[PDB]
Scaffold this motif. Sequence first.
Motif, PDB file in Angstrom:
ATOM      1  N   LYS A   1       2.913   6.051  14.512  1.00 49.35           N
ATOM      2  CA  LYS A   1       3.363   6.245  13.140  1.00 49.35           C
ATOM      3  C   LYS A   1       4.051   7.601  12.986  1.00 49.35           C
TER       4      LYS A   1
ATOM      5  N   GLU B   1      -1.069   1.727   8.464  1.00 49.04           N
ATOM      6  CA  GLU B   1      -2.076   2.100   7.476  1.00 49.04           C
ATOM      7  C   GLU B   1      -2.957   0.916   7.100  1.00 49.04           C
ATOM      8  N   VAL B   2      -2.378  -0.283   7.032  1.00 52.49           N
ATOM      9  CA  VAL B   2      -3.130  -1.445   6.570  1.00 52.49           C
ATOM     10  C   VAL B   2      -4.293  -1.735   7.509  1.00 52.49           C
TER      11      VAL B   2
ATOM     12  N   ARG C   1       9.202   3.916   5.825  1.00 50.17           N
ATOM     13  CA  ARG C   1       8.019   3.478   5.091  1.00 50.17           C
ATOM     14  C   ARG C   1       7.438   2.188   5.657  1.00 50.17           C
ATOM     15  N   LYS C   2       8.277   1.321   6.229  1.00 48.87           N
ATOM     16  CA  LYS C   2       7.785   0.059   6.771  1.00 48.87           C
ATOM     17  C   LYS C   2       6.894   0.277   7.988  1.00 48.87           C
TER      18      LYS C   2
ATOM     19  N   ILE D   1       0.822  -1.208   0.000  1.00 55.24           N
ATOM     20  CA  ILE D   1       0.000   0.000   0.000  1.00 55.24           C
ATOM     21  C   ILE D   1       0.856   1.258   0.000  1.00 55.24           C
ATOM     22  N   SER D   2       2.002   1.230   0.675  1.00 56.51           N
ATOM     23  CA  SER D   2       2.835   2.422   0.762  1.00 56.51           C
ATOM     24  C   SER D   2       3.687   2.599  -0.487  1.00 56.51           C
TER      25      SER D   2
ATOM     26  N   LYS E   1       3.417   1.545   6.920  1.00 49.36           N
ATOM     27  CA  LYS E   1       2.604   0.513   6.283  1.00 49.36           C
ATOM     28  C   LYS E   1       1.947  -0.386   7.320  1.00 49.36           C
ATOM     29  N   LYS E   2       2.669  -0.705   8.393  1.00 45.74           N
ATOM     30  CA  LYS E   2       2.103  -1.523   9.459  1.00 45.74           C
ATOM     31  C   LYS E   2       0.833  -0.897  10.020  1.00 45.74           C
TER      32      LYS E   2
END
Lengths: 112, 91, 48, 252, 76, 24
Positions: free
Chosen positions: D176, B29-30, B22-23, B9-10, B26-27
Amino acid sequence: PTRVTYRRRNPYNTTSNRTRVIKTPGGQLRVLHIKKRGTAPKCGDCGIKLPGIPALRPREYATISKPKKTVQRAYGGSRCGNCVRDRIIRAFLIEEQKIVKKVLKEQSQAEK
Amino acid sequence: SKRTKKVGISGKYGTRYGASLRKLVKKQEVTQHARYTCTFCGKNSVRRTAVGIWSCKSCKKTMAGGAYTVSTPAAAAMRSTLRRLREITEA
Amino acid sequence: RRQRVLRRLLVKYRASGKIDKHLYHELYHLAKGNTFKHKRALVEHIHR
Amino acid sequence: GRVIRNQRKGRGSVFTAHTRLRKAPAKFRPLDYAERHGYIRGIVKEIIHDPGRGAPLARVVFRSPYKYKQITETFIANEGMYTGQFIYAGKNAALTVGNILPLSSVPEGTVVSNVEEKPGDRGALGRTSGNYVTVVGHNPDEGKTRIKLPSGAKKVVPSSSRGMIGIVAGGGRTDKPLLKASRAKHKFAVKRNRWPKTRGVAMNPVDHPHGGGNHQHIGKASTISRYAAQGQKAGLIAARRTGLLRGTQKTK
Amino acid sequence: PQEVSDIKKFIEICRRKDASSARIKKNPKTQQIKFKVRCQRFLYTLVLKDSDKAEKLKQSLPPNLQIKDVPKRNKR
Amino acid sequence: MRAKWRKKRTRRLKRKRRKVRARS
RNA sequence: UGGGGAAAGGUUCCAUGUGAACAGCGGUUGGACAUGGGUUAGUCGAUCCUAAGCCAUAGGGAAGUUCCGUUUCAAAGGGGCACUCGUGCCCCGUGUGGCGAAAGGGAAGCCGGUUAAUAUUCCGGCACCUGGAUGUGGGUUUUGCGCGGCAACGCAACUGAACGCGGAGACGACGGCGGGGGCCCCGGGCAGAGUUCUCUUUUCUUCUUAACGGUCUAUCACCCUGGAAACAGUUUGUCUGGAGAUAGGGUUUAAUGGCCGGAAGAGCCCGACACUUCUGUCGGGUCCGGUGCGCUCUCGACGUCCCUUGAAAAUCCGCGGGAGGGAAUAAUUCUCACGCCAGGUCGUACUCAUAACCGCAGCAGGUCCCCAAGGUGAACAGCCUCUGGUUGAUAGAACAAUGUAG
RNA sequence: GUGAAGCCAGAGGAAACUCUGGUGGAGGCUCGCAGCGGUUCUGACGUGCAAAUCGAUCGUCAAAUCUGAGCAUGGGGGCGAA
Ligand SMILES: [Zn+2]
Ligand SMILES: [Zn+2]
């Protein structure tokens, strides 16, 4: 292909200067100024638009006869009707539970 | 026809902000864009509106949860402790 | 355009009675995938 | 020299707080007879988000014991409450998530939130997303309760203070990365005027004590004494120690 | 302007205190006859397709108010 | 309906009543 | 380089006349000089409400000019009735000022003509809103405050005080898709005009319908029967369904849609007679279809992003409740139809810019918005044209060096 | 111009799961008009049109973009991505 101009002193496009183009019996293209669009009233509980009531600006509702502004039943306005049935059923069952609860407590626990 | 090997997704971020950063995003956002089954009506339609607000699209119920998840492990562990403690002590 | 043409034809066939609902539904999902190139190819497949 | 930046913030001209979009503050009900001896209940109408804060707010509607009307309130929402839930407040209220009952009627080991420092000030402690306080023990004589604060400190409060069972919603908001300069700007644009921020070493001697020079450096010890005149406190104030925290922290 | 559907109530309109005047316009091309009356608020119009019944209508209305013919090219 | 609408209607009835009383 | 506005300017607008001065040359011309004339509103604005913000009151500081304070340690308000007559009674009470927007919120007007100079104001026609008084028609009632439909709900009316609840005013950015008005484009017909050595059943122009009303319709949504797995319906874009789908039949929000009034009596295009002028008169015509990833405005249903979730007040309506009041020969607090009277104050001329504002000036500078034709082309790119507007920037003769631009 | 999540159809495998063709339209992404800015020629002019202008060539252009009116901060004070 003639172009048009405003007819009032306000030259800005500010959500209250609304115009539409009409053709006149003199064969000319003019500008006609119009008002805003009314919004339909919503329900008190669920929040959906009630059927059978027109959508107008808040001032125009004072000139219309009563039967055009309501619906002939309990809670005619502001309630959709699906919510009205829920009120009738819910109110009846709650009171019935109150009768059995008080009889059970007064009799089975104050017998001494 | 997978269009990606690992980015997922990222992939909208292109080649910016560094691989490691970025990792982590992504964790998170999913899990916030997915859909969850409603606990009241049972349908599979519950989505996040605000940072801590989740609401069902069918029965219109609204519940307060975690930032990026419906519930958090710390909050879940507390309900069971409170339930077990209450019922033994007073009953 | 192509999706509207194929979907419009299927509605005509079902109402008249040339095909039933079980074949109609299966062909609908086959058309959503890039299976039929044009109108002629779809009717030929129906006959077979 | 001139007046340095951190002295101007006290005048309150440009560095005030933006408050157009905030509707009401979050407080408990005033202490009344009904909640001191029994309990009352109210309906949860909405779960709303207000700008400049995490921890989504909740709107609750109560009745009036003396007059024919109803009053609406605004609480901080604990995780797990839902619209239409009945919540109860008082001394004899049940011990479930969302209830409000005095801190004396609570067994040890439970987590609560929005605890009153003194009975009647309507919430002071533990009201941030994902935070809580823990009760430790009671003193039935000279009623006072020991609690543990989120920072780790311990405190003693009067036994009549109030608290709402559970954990403040909002979870792990700060995990985040912001990842973008714009995202930081949006967060602060609704709170205060404190973004961006300029390093004191890049200024001129007239502007900041760290001042200028032919190389960018401080020039003197960066630890400033506790009792120094305003305009001197620029750096680490009253530092007990310094450097990377390797071992464990003795203070508790 | 407001339609008057039939003949019966049109004469009822003309027998009013505020019926100031009336006029007649005839369209030769479409064989149509129009009766107009001017009241305080509105201008009621009655449309007749036939021409024979028009003559009877003209004399039935009260004689007090005037009746005109609306010639071509009214002068400015 | 707003109060002024109600005030006008009740003022009319009061005037009408006095005329009847004056006549009789 | 067209047609109109906000800020700013202040008579620069129109007519008649003119020696000097000004218009970096001339001048019979002029935004210059001299003499007269010109700006009509119940409907367009101000006037009303609040926002950021400013200032009185209760109080506290300061030698003092004054600083803080805006609901704060205050005895702070407003509603009804009757009396010959104002001066007598009776209820409620948590709260109690003003200023601040010609781009925010907001009751109501359209077409045709007219003057040397103004008009959504003047004249003609046809309408609307608020406030204040009152009469006829129809409705209701002797079961005192209406009937119909299973239902969503319907109709020309069809009691309702204190207090209370709810809705409208009331709101972000972007993406594709569908309906409507205007423009552009193609074919046929009636008139007039241009071209014609030759060709062209050819090329060009007019063919219009306002506010305000009646009537039939148009996505979403909702109601009744019934009970779905060989699972079905379905969007360009996978959502919906035993918490009741498909199917059949109904109710309703939304016209810038069709027809009728207004309205052909108007406006426009041709033809035939009249003559110092005051003056004109009379004939005809004013149609029928098609098309689209076209341009522009508007409405509706979906979707994406956020540690960002995208104003307040005046004003207007419905409901819960049941105070008071009222007929059997008429009374009536009937939000229905028609009818009577009134609507004060100030602005309105003209420019908005290579000459009317600011830069010492008739200065290649700077200064906020609306409307937007044809061809080539992916295109608001560049190049040519139509409507409309200019032909205004000191000129004549010759073609060395050195220059600026190509 | 490029084509991220989600979705449809087909093929391979004992399974875990993997290939191929479409659909969709994300991003402080990209070429490029108007607007905004001002790198080079160290061009023109330099008692100039101008007490900072003119021409060609350039940077960005759906977002930390551009902008009107109303209100606040006043000199050892304000404001400052410095
Ligand atoms: Zn409802
Ligand atoms: Zn649900």
